[PDB]
Ligand SMILES: NC(=O)c1ccc[n+]([C@@H]2O[C@H](COP(=O)([O-])OP(=O)(O)OC[C@H]3O[C@@H](n4cnc5c(N)ncnc54)[C@H](OP(=O)(O)O)[C@@H]3O)[C@@H](O)[C@H]2O)c1
Ligand SMILES: O=C(O)C1=C[C@@H](O)[C@@H](O)[C@H](O)C1
């Protein structure tokens with residue numbers, strides 16, 4: 001039967017096991033998706049076990065960047081972003097992909113959030129990289145900001161983006177929180193309410209809590225908003241299709257995640 | 264939502280659509296597998312389409328060899344054999360594999376055919392190369408013959424095997440017809456009756472007719488025989504697993520192919 005897993009440290013609170021349990025069941029497929037606690041020092045030994053016992057696996061912190069080297073093939077996008085979140089095993093060979101980028105795009109689209117820019121991504125980290133990448137290829141003008149200017153400006157040239165000051169947020173039509181600000185902090189938001197734009201949309205990758213201060217403020221300002229669950233659901237559905245050729249219902253996966261969160 | 268197909272020319276009488284319709288059904292999956300006529304020249308474009316609406320495809324004559332120069336990745340085995348018969352599509356990328364080689368070995372095992380050599384592969388073409396590759400991997404002493412001596416000599420040095428005269432067949436214990444001799448021609452066989460050994464086994468990749476002159480000669484000599492259907496079924500099943508992660512019943516697929524005949 002189909003054997004899947006999410007590798008990373010920690011993974012005790014990953015919502016993937018629950019989402020893919022729904023995927024397997026709803027598709028009438030026999031298999032399992034487990035969470036394998038895997039530190040970076042155990043990545044090599046774990047990948048070798050993947051080559052022989054798993055059809056595929058997702059990768060989470062802190063294995064997304066240190067995985068490319070141990071795989072037999074890495075997709076272009078995954079090479080540029082410099083991160084792999086989805087691994088496929090066929091004939092003992094491992095192939096690396098990044099479903100976060102496309103997952104993000106499909107979530108916005110399916111969520112009614114127009115890909116009308118300029119889009120501003122807060123955070124020049126791994127999360128920001130994937131998002132910055134996706135918005136570009138989508139056909140939007142994209143700016144990037146980072147708590148630390150260094151990072152931002154460097155990411156702007158690599159991808160060919162524009163590192164702007166936080167104030168520029170007011171001129172953006174798409175705002176994306178790619179920082180860990182607000183994570184389990186209902187009182188925190190990386191962007192002062194006064195810097196929010198008139199019209200546009202806001203997406204927060206943080207889903208704990210679901211309605212972050214960022215989103216609450218964005219909504220009050222009248223912007224379209226989307227939580228972090230839709231992206232989580234699509235990157236997972238896209239990963240399942242990549243492994244089997246079958247796309248589980250993204251809405252159903254988000255719902256499964258929702259239930260696992262208890263909110 | 265699983266869209267598959269066999270690319271090649273001709274493919275009008277391919278048994279793959281039947282075998283795979285069974286695989287899908289038997290596995291409670293929804294999908295399709297069609298025969299898609301494709302000439303050498305129409306390949307470069309056909310693959311672009313595959314990238315857009317196909318999860319995977321099988322390639323047959325005369326696309327197997329040319330397909331390599333139009334794929335994102337090719338397996339080490341497919342590379343060495345020099346041919347791809349199975350393509351997987353993910354994120355618009357194309358990966359090439361060869362299930363003919365592993366399929367042949369699985370067919371022999373499932374069919375009760377002992378892996379005992381020397382093995383003589385007749386034909387140094389694409390099918391012969393896949394079979395030779397498989398037999399070499401299995402550790403048997405492999406000999407190869409080809410109507411055109413050069414092709415066999417090149418393959419022998421290339422794979423570290425031995426090119427032999429057709430007469431050495433009397434000393435082989437496993438004989439495999441990987442030539443097109445006998446294809447829809449009951450009067451033709453690649454090996455003269457008198458050159459068959461009196462002990463061993465024979466397998467014919469040609470399955471039209473099912474009981475080729477070659478297999479009838481082998482059977483008449485007392486050799487254990489296997490038709491081309493088990494291999495056709497196993498290469499198909501293995502390809503289906505490459506595409507979905509699921510392995511359909513090879514016996515069931517062979518049965519489906521038999522009926523399609
Ligand atoms: N059962 C299965 O699943 C399966 C899988 C693969 C292939 N096959 C079958 O096995 C055959 C091999 O296919 P392929 O891709 O290798 O290419 P092909 O074009 O079908 O066959 C090429 C081979 O046949 C030889 N040949 C042709 N005419 C000959 C003749 N009159 N006398 C002696 N040898 C002759 C060639 O030798 P020269 O170098 O002298 O031309 C070469 O070795 C096909 O007929 C195919 O239908 C079956
Ligand atoms: O929490 C999880 O299980 C995941 C989180 C994201 O990083 C995804 O990119 C990953 O594929 C799975």
Ligand SMILES: O=C(O)C1=C[C@@H](O)[C@@H](O)[C@H](O)C1
Nearest residue numbers: 269277278279321322323348
């Ligand atoms: O006739 C067919 O449909 C096929 C013939 C062989 O070349 C196989 O290698 C191919 O995958 C399917």
